[PDB]
């Protein structure tokens, strides 16, 4: 059974270098073409590079935005595909997929020699994050409820976990007792290289003034743990 074990992805500063690896099994690695494909969260797929069998040259092709910075290579004796990434830039932040490719020969006479190149098997991917930041715990600010966050008998409140690095961070409400109506949004990576996310919960407006609301934030990478009470505000 075929599998593509990817490794080597993580954090790196702008201008740094990183090497991704993809150890394969379940098929003849030395007889198969390989490619790298990356996806930036929020955008689509982008082919990065491809490499053929060693005996074919090898034939190597790069996408324009990476030509001159990325190097694709392979080690048949260890069934490993590599991607040496140099002079990394914030635009390189993405999930990088390992792929085993195949070619469908064209059988039309005037097209003999041409082929359709497609990605046959994809790896689960590996994340590469380009940021200048270092480990930093979040600041947890309140999203105070008010008339400007109420729709009839329903009010909204939350917590703003801002300026932390790296992922992840956990958020709960009232020590896990409040779970209905909660929405913890995916964190966003800011232009500063730090993360920020929001956690909100809609509650009956009549419960304001009686029910205490606390968001429990934990950022293990920085050993920072905070419990933040959120109270109504006039607006």
């Amino acid at each position: 059974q075929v599998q593509l074990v990817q490794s080597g992805g993580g954090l790196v500063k702008p201008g740094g270098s990183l090497t991704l690896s993809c150890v394969t099994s379940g098929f003849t690695f030395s007889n198969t073409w390989m490619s790298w494909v990356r996806q930036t969260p929020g955008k689509g797929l982008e082919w990065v590079a491809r490499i053929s069998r060693v005996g074919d040259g090898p034939i190597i092709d790069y996408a324009a935005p990476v030509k001159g910075r990325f190097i694709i290579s392979r080690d048949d004796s260890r069934n490993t595909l590599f991607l040496h990434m140099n002079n990394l830039k914030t635009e390189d932040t993405a999930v990088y997929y390992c792929t085993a490719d195949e070619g469908a020969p064209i059988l039309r006479f005037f097209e003999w020699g041409y082929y359709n190149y497609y990605m046959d098997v994809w790896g689960k991917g590996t994340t590469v994050i380009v940021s200048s930041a270092s480990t930093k715990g979040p600041s947890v600010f309140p999203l105070a409820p008010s008339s400007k966050s109420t729709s009839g008998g329903t009010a909204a409140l939350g917590c703003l976990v801002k300026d932390y690095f790296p992922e992840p961070v956990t958020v709960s409400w009232n020590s896990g007792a409040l779970t209905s109506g909660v929405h913890t949004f995916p964190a966003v990576l800011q232009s500063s290289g730090l993360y920020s996310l929001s956690s909100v919960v809609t509650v009956p407006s009549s419960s304001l003034g009686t029910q205490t609301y606390i968001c429990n934030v934990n950022h293990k990478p920085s050993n920072t743990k905070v419990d933040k009470r959120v109270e109504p505000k006039s607006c």
């Binding site: 030395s30 007889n31 198969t32 053929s52 020969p105 005037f110 003999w112 020699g113």
Partner: peptide
């Protein structure tokens, strides 16, 4: 084990190059 020294592999890329060698004759 590789009992045959002259054992090598064949894939789709060999097909395409051959069909091209034939179109050019």
């Amino acid at each position: 084990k590789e009992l045959d020294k002259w054992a090598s592999l064949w894939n789709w890329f060999d097909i395409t190059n051959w069909l091209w060698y034939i179109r050019k004759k």
